[PDB]
Design a protein around this nucleic acid. Structure first.
Lengths: 77, 170, 217, 193
RNA sequence: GUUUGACCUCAAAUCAGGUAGGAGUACCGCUGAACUUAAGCAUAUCAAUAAGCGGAGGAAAAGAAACCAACCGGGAUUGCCUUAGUAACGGCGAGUGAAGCGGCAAAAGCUCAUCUGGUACCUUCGGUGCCCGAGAGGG
RNA sequence: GUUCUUUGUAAAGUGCCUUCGAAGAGUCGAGUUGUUUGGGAAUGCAGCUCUAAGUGGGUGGUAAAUUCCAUCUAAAGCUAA
RNA sequence: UUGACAUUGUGAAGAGACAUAGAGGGUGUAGAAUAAGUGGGAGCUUCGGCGCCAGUGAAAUACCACUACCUUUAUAGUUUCUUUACUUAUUCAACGGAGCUGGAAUUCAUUUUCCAAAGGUCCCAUUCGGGGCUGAUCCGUU
């Protein structure tokens, strides 16, 4: 988890930006769910694995609700 | 009980509530605002209800909000603690839903409530914002390492029986 | 010290990180002028055609001096003397065979290439041997010496599948430097076989001699 | 959007945690309580409002519980009596949804009312929970408001049996357009052409 | 440690007010056969038929596009017409079997996300008098 | 055809300026099991399991990069003839 | 009948791996040995070491990245499987701890177990009559 590294919040932001890129790519051949696995699996597998594992489970939770609403808003404006 | 992934807990001895509760009744009661005009300056605005409260925080008008601890379903109040911190708007958490409704001078209970614009009480209000950070200055490491429970008498004794166990028996 | 200036996680654009450009001028610690070099991880295959080999002409030199020996026959020897250090006949192969190897690289004629063949055991190991693949034999020999002295640079894929060449000196200006990496990448990116799979430029890195490296997108 | 969007968001989720605690605890209450549970409040305000839920007289929110699984058909022990294509106990499934059965049950008990509405809200394992809006036609409050006024007219009575509800339309396969669709204008409407 | 008055959640009663259950021939939503056909038969067919059940109205049901499309244009939804025994299904056997369009009947676009009850007053589908509970922006 | 009578305010057209939400999640989509259909990797619906984004998204008769084309905003509702 | 998935939580580790950081070694012909396979490359530091030079060969052996593979460490992980422990969701069936004082035992001691409506007061009355509390017990459906 804490740190990584290097960088921090900027790295957290990359991990989350990367996960969106994997998830859209994962949508775009449908499934998603097995494909979320296959898209990660057909890739290096380290940083990516940890992000995916959370993404499936719990899945940040409160923080997604937070971030999404700020994004919704700032596409609202 | 529960399991649980973290919800909500913390601070409200009655003293810290009581000052905030009298300052909310005076937040409404202070009303003039006032018989002539078109434009015409306030004293008071109080708005009750979860929807009004959330909007006024996003508008950044609200000076200080109250949330009730006792809210069920839980998911109504959930947005505001995080949201208001983002905005830098202070919040108090009163123990009961009913209490919050009476002071806002509603007929019924209030889930949340706000003071939007106070009246001449700069120092005491600031003094309560500070008292409110004095009780939960916190940032968010939210919080359950799992809690839930309080153990039960037979399990609690088992805890004792296990401590003896480490000391000579296991 | 040098490590702190670089960011491993960051992948910079050609101008921002030196690569060939500004920041690595700071990076190259050494007393002598270092060469800056370019490194690729290329997805490419064991097959010969899928290898990456050709020669780019750097707009602005490597700024190293390279002494040629070039062996030619007829009006081509005459032509040689114009832009060449040591004009050589077909006779001269016996001298290099005995011991003399005072030359960086060698360029030869098509005519010469019969005679050349004897030279290859000695040459082939250092990879000095002339080959069409690294354009060292052509009957337009005069133009081609001009290119190698200007600073045409050689590119060879490894068995390892990394591809490498020196781009310039660190000391040369940032603006100058950027042009050379660009030509080199452009030349790489074209040479790339169709037969190669997804992303021909897998990774791109430049370093100096001594220093840490920064990656380019 | 404004309050609701958060609540609505939490719903999208549901393995996932702030909703997930609420609901896990609510499962306990759900198992104890009857097939009929009338409730003052939408555990759903977000979904309910778009639902045309407005607080106003005659309106109720009600929670209904329907079993989960396939279909079981009578008459076991005395198995038919037909060729193998006919044959099916468990093989066959309801065509109608579990949501739709829940609406018909709710409306059956509350004869007085007509269902506007069905929203799904907890999955446990054995049970499926649907929270149903039923609307009083008969009184003047619902009537005086133009937005609601439609429910009242005599044609709408027993809309849930008739399949007129949003779910009922959906289970006809109706939506809404062309090829997919053609024999959804009605089932009987093709009329053995 | 201990109670009392009050806040809201669940429950039960009660009388009031309001409505439903049932019915009329068929029309009009689900679950769901068989003989029969293929000269047998098991997919297929009969058939999404009949039946059973639920339930509404004077018509019902469907409705203004997350449509059509194979172009460049159309522009809500039924029905009629014909598309067509075409596409498609299928022991690719027997059989099964459309749609878009074209144009007709007829046309229509909108709408969501102070209210009620009590008593009084009248010219009683109303409103007044009170009390009670609960597509958007600037000048 | 005749007759009574309240103020208005805000809506709306035309034209200038930025701009933009009231737009609906166990849904969209997937597998594995059905039944239905003309629906064929490509009808519609049920069930179990799993599960998005938020101006992003869906469609365009198998599935996968791109610019873009061409069209439309589900998970809501009403409605005469 | 039998395995898997949902129901769905807790964490002990035994065993398997995957971040970086610090180690070591890197089994093709000849070659003392350490030429695995890549950019580079004339030095980095000085009492020095390696290049220098030996010597062979296709290519030689400073030094700052790199990185296949054998192995092994730290920071603070995380991951499957078990099992194997543990209860809080859950299912099915239909009391717990303290308090006296009694008795048994330990420990010099601290310490640690085993067991099992009357009359009083108050409040009306102040008058009969009544009520509250106490009446061995304090705390927190199986």
């Amino acid at each position: 988890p804490k740190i990584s590294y290097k960088k921090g919040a900027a790295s957290n932001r990359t991990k989350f930006v990367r996960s969106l890129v994997r998830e859209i790519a994962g949508l775009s051949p449908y499934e998603r769910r097995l494909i979320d696995l296959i898209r990660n699996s057909g890739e290096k597998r380290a940083r990516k694995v940890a992000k995916k594992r959370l993404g499936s489970f719990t899945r940040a939770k409160a923080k997604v609700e937070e971030m999404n609403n700020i994004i919704a808003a700032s596409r609202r404006h | 009980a529960a399991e649980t992934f973290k919800l909500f807990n913390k601070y409200r001895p009655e003293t810290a509530a009581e000052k905030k509760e009298r300052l909310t009744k005076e937040a409404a009661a202070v009303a003039e605002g006032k018989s002539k005009q078109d434009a015409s300056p306030k004293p008071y605005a109080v708005k009750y209800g979860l929807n009004h409260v959330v909007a006024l925080i996003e508008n950044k008008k609200a000076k200080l909000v109250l949330i009730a601890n006792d809210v069920d379903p839980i998911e109504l109040v959930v947005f505001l603690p995080a949201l208001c911190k983002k905005m830098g708007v202070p919040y108090a958490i009163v123990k009961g839903k009913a209490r919050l409704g009476t002071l806002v001078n509603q007929k019924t209970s209030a889930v949340a409530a706000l003071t939007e614009v106070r009246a001449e009480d700069e120092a005491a209000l600031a003094k309560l914002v500070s008292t409110i950070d004095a009780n939960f200055a916190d940032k968010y490491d939210e919080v359950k390492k799992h809690w839930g429970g309080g153990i039960l008498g037979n399990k609690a004794q088992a805890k004792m029986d296990k401590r003896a166990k480490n000391s000579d028996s296991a | 010290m040098s490590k702190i200036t670089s960011s491993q996680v960051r992948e910079h654009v050609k101008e921002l990180l030196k690569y060939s450009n500004e920041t690595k001028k700071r990076n190259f610690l050494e007393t002598v002028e270092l060469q800056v070099g370019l490194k690729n991880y290329d997805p490419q295959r064991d097959k010969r055609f899928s290898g990456s080999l050709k020669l780019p002409n750097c707009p602005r030199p490597n700024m190293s001096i390279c002494i040629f020996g070039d062996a030619f026959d007829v009006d081509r020897a005459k032509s040689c003397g114009v832009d060449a250090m040591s004009v050589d006949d077909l006779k001269k192969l016996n001298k290099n065979k005995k011991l003399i190897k005072k030359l960086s690289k060698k360029y030869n004629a098509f005519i010469a290439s019969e005679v050349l063949i004897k030279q290859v055991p000695r040459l082939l190991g250092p990879q000095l041997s002339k080959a069409g693949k690294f354009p060292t034999p052509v009957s337009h020999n005069d133009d081609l010496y001009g290119k190698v002295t200007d600073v045409r640079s050689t590119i060879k894929f490894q068995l390892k599948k990394v591809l490498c060449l020196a781009v310039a000196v660190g000391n040369v200006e940032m603006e100058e430097d950027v042009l050379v990496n660009q030509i080199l990448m452009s030349v790489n990116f074209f040479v790339s076989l169709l037969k190669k799979n997804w992303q021909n430029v897998g990774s791109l890195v430049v370093k100096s001699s001594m220093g840490p490296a920064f990656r380019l997108y | 959007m404004g309050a609701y969007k958060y609540l609505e968001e939490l719903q999208r989720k549901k393995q996932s945690d702030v909703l997930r605690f609420l609901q896990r605890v609510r499962v306990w209450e759900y198992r104890q309580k009857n097939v009929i549970h009338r409730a003052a409040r939408p555990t759903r305000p977000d979904k309910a409002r778009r639902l045309g839920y407005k607080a106003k007289q005659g309106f109720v929110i009600y929670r209904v519980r329907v079993r989960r699984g396939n279909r079981k058909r009578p008459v076991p022990k005395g198995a038919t009596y037909g060729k193998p294509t006919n044959q099916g106990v468990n093989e066959l499934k309801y065509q109608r949804s579990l949501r739709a059965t829940a609406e018909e049950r709710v409306g059956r008990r509350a004869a007085n009312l007509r269902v506007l509405n069905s929203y799904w809200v907890n999955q446990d394992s054995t049970y499926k929970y649907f929270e149903v809006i039923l609307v009083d036609p008969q009184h003047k409050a619902i009537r005086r408001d133009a937005r609601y006024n439609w429910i009242c007219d005599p044609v709408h009575k027993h809309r849930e049996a008739r399949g007129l509800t949003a779910t009922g339309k959906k289970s006809r396969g109706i939506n809404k357009g062309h090829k997919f669709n053609n024999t959804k204008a009605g089932r009987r409407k093709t009329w053995k052409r």
